[PDB]
């Protein structure tokens, strides 16, 4: 049944692993379920056998849980551990080279000697330790012949002898994966220094001050810092190899045990938090150390949705975990169906330079690209304070029209600066009642959530003026594409090809983007939320499509912040505020690639062609695919090489004052862990 089973390492670990069932037993025994301690060799058996249905959740360093993005491997971190207090959650712990004072090795000074990992596999005292001097060929076999001698538990001694050196066991409890070898984890691979087995020991800052013989044996012990200098073990802030995560409780992504395995431990930290009572202690372990979890921890925090090991671990981390054990093309994200085919037959033109990739939602891009499994695309200023948030950094400016007095550009728009477009909130001129003053119950139509037309500014200023974040509350019956289904803001949408695209946050609806949501005025809202003058490019048959045959501009007609109306082609006076221009968004490391790679590309199928010749990439077969139907060019960031100096103040601060109604889990799952 829903018996959530824990798994255990060791004896010590099974006699506190029984004290937590018989426990909570009592505390939670109804709207509860019971725990089961099965036991284990080691965690890297224990990662697996939850995979293969065995056992349910442990509590491991996600870098073990690094093997799992394979078949019978796939886990997700479900509840992560903290430490300080519960005001301020420290969801980190930095990694740090361990010496004692007088050998004064430094840095590069740790060519071939004598050193303690805390385990074969674990980002402590393996993955973090060999990025810092990454090897030519980065492997883990290398650092086998590299170092003469190690104390790496967990691995093979059959093939690598000198890999098991310094481990002091008994036979085949030698060099073990668990309390079995007294040289193990954070704890046992420090007394390398305290006895003297070898001169350097990788551990964790927490199991340094914790494992202290004297509270003043802070100065007996220095650390190598990534300056090529020593510093006393009391500044690992500033001297440190690398901060890796917290450890997190596992559980299969799907079907699991999670909500019964978040339920258990919200109790068990109502009772057996940290010091609350006095008997049993959760994060205080008698025998072992850290017994079932990290002894230094002050509790765990639910990690939020759509966090992965990869969101969670961090690219930076994987990108250095990738090359230890295991290009020219530009793997696009695309949105949609539509836009996923505009993209295959740029994939064919481009001759290779530009590959694909799909995703449903913008958000879903965003965290594809974060990753590696898409490399760039363009992202709207509303969805570039998430990826700005999320780590990616802007490449290029989606330039649109420029200010109309020249007769045509050239090679004038790759540097030509742009004030982005004005959004404007536009409504029929046929109804004489609508107004600024009154759209509350008033049926509106939104471009999509998160976007800076229909989203986060008509609805930021909605929400100065009312107080809110229950907007179906405002407008009775709306569209806005990403909103729930069973409430108010997905009534008016008309949806896809079949059902499920009812309110999906892609072009797979009827009223989905700035040509949708006109569509949807047309026909169902009062209100509708768009950018810079979008409804002269479907009106008086600019739009072949059914919904834009007779319809002139004059039955639209804007509304002001103040109240009154102006021509729709007069927005620069009636407007809702100036937004900062879309994007194309990417990593630190294809920052230069895809702007050189897409400087050529424009170059080739760029506003440069002809009729149908070459490739319309600034234009799409329906609305806005890859790129918005009205961009000129992709310009130069210059200075603005951030999202925040991208953006700007002005938009930037717009989103923080908004972020409380902002419900992104993507922003919230690269937030998770404050820094």
Request: hydrophobic letters at 35%; glycine letters at 8%; aromatic letters at 10%.
């Amino acid at each position: 049944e829903k018996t959530i089973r824990w798994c255990v390492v060791s004896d010590h670990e099974a006699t506190k692993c029984s004290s937590f069932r018989d426990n909570m037993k009592k505390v939670l025994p109804a709207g509860g379920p019971a725990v089961t301690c099965v036991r284990k060799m080691s965690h890297p058996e224990c990662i697996r056998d939850i995979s293969a249905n065995k056992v349910d959740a442990v509590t491991v360093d996600g870098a073990l849980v690094a093997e799992a993005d394979l078949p019978h491997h796939s886990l997700k971190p479900i509840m992560a551990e903290y430490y300080g207090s519960k005001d301020d959650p420290k969801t980190h712990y930095y990694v740090v080279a361990m010496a004692k004072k007088g050998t004064g090795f430094q840095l590069n000074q740790l060519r071939g000697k004598k050193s303690c990992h805390t385990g074969l596999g674990w980002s402590a005292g393996w993955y973090v330790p060999l990025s810092t001097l990454l090897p030519s060929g980065s492997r883990e076999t290398a650092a086998a012949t590299f170092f003469s001698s190690s104390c790496v538990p967990c691995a093979d001694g059959k093939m690598f002898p000198s890999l098991c050196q310094l481990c002091a066991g008994k036979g085949t409890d030698k060099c073990a994966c668990s309390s079995r070898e007294p040289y193990f984890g954070s704890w046992g691979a420090l007394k390398c220094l305290q006895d003297g087995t070898a001169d350097v020991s990788f551990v964790k800052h927490l199991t340094v001050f914790e494992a202290m013989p004297t509270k003043a044996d802070r100065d007996q012990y220095e650390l190598l810092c990534m300056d090529n200098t020593r510093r006393p073990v009391e500044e690992y802030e500033q001297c440190y190899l690398a901060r890796v995560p917290s450890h997190v409780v596992v559980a299969r992504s799907v079907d699991g045990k999670e909500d019964s395995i978040q339920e258990l431990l919200r109790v068990a930290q109502e009772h057996f938090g940290k010091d609350k009572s006095s008997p049993f202690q959760l994060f205080g372990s008698p025998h072992g150390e850290d017994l079932l979890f990290t002894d230094a921890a002050h509790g765990l925090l639910r990690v939020p949705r759509k966090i992965d090991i990869s969101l969670y671990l961090g690219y930076e981390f994987l990108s250095a975990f990738r090359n230890l054990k295991r290009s020219q093309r530009v793997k696009w994200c695309a949105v949609g169906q539509q836009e996923r085919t505009k993209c295959d037959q740029w994939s064919a033109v481009s001759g290779g330079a530009l590959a694909c990739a799909t995703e449903e939602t913008p958000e879903d891009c965003i965290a594809a690209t974060m990753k590696g499994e898409a490399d760039a695309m363009s992202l709207d200023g509303g969805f570039a304070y998430v990826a700005g948030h999320c780590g990616l950094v802007p490449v290029l400016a989606e330039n649109y029209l420029s200010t109309h007095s020249s007769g045509r550009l050239g090679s004038k728009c790759v540097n030509a600066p742009l004030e982005g477009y004005y959004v404007v909130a536009v409504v029929k001129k046929s109804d004489v009642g609508i107004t600024w003053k009154s759209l509350q119950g008033k049926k509106s139509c939104h471009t999509a959530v998160g976007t800076s037309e229909g989203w986060n500014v008509p609805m930021g200023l909605i929400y100065d003026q009312t107080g809110s974040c229950k907007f179906d509350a405002f407008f009775s019956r709306s569209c806005a594409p990403g909103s729930d289904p069973d409430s108010p803001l997905c009534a008016l949408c008309v949806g896809g090809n079949n059902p499920a695209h009812m309110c999906a946050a892609n072009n797979a609806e009827g009223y989905h983007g700035s040509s949708g949501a006109l569509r949807c005025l047309v026909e169902k809202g009062d209100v509708a939320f768009m950018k810079h003058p979008t409804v002269l490019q479907n009106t008086d048959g600019k739009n072949p499509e059914p919904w834009a045959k007779g319809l002139k501009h004059e039955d639209f007609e804007l509304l002001c912040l103040d109240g009154t109306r102006k021509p729709v082609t007069e927005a620069q006076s009636c407007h809702l505020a100036r937004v900062p221009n879309r994007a194309v968004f990417s990593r630190k490391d294809k920052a230069d690639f895809v702007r050189r790679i897409l400087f050529n590309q424009q170059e080739l199928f760029g506003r440069n062609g002809f009729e149908y010749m070459m490739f319309q990439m600034f234009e799409s077969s329906a609305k806005d695919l890859l790129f918005s139907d009205d961009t000129e060019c992709l310009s130069n960031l210059q200075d603005k090489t951030t999202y925040k100096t991208y953006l700007g103040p002005q938009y930037l601060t717009l989103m923080d004052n908004f972020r409380q109604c902002l419900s992104s889990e993507l922003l919230d799952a690269c937030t998770f862990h404050k820094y």
